[PDB]
Amino acid sequence: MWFEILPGIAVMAACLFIPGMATAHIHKFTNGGKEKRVAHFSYQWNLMERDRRISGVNRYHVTKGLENID
């Protein structure tokens, strides 16, 4: 045997492993490695646009700390 079904299932699991984590990795690689922002409502989109405008490099994920206000 009954365990001879275990190999194929394992391979299938490996395939189902591929998308999820990959997406996560892609998101990180595209957003400075910090869990790409979710904008469900207009307020969150406005926050993202404000960050993009004040970043100075046209990237919303480049956050500015207290060192940017003298």
Partner 1 sequence: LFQAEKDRRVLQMLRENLEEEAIIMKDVPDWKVGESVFHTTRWVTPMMGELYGLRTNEEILSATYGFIWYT
Partner 2 sequence: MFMINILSLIIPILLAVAFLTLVERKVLGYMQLRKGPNVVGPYGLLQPIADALKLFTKEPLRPATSSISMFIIAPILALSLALTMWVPLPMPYPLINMNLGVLFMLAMSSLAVYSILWSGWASNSKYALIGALRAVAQTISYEVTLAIILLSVLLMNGSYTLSTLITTQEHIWMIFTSWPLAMMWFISTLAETNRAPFDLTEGESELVSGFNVEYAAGPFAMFFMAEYANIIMMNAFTAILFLGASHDPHTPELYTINFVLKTLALTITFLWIRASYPRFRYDQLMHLLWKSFLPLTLALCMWHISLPIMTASIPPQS
Partner 3 sequence: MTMYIAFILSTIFVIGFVGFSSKPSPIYGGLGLIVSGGVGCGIVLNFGGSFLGLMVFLIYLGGMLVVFGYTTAMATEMYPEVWVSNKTVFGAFVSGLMMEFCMVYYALKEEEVEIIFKFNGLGDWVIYDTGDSGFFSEEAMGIAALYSYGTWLVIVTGWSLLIGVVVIMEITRGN
Ligand X SMILES: CCCCCCCCCCCCCCCCC[C@@H](O)O[C@H](CO[C@H](O)CCCCCCCCCCCCCCC)COP(=O)(O)OCC[N+](C)(C)C
d(CA 55, CA 32): 13
Q: Which stretch binds ligand X (CB under 6 A): 11-19, 30-38, 41-49, 57-65?
A: 11-19
* CA gap 31, 16 in Å, rounded: 24
Q: Give the residue with the Cβ less far from partner 3, 36 or 39.
A: 39
For position 11 contacting ligand X by CB under 6 A, the verdict is yes
Which residues 6+ apart lie within 8 Å of 39 measured at CB? 45, 47, 48
Residues 23-42 that bind partner 3 (CB under 8 A): 41-42
Number of chain positions touching partner 2 (CB under 8 A):
27
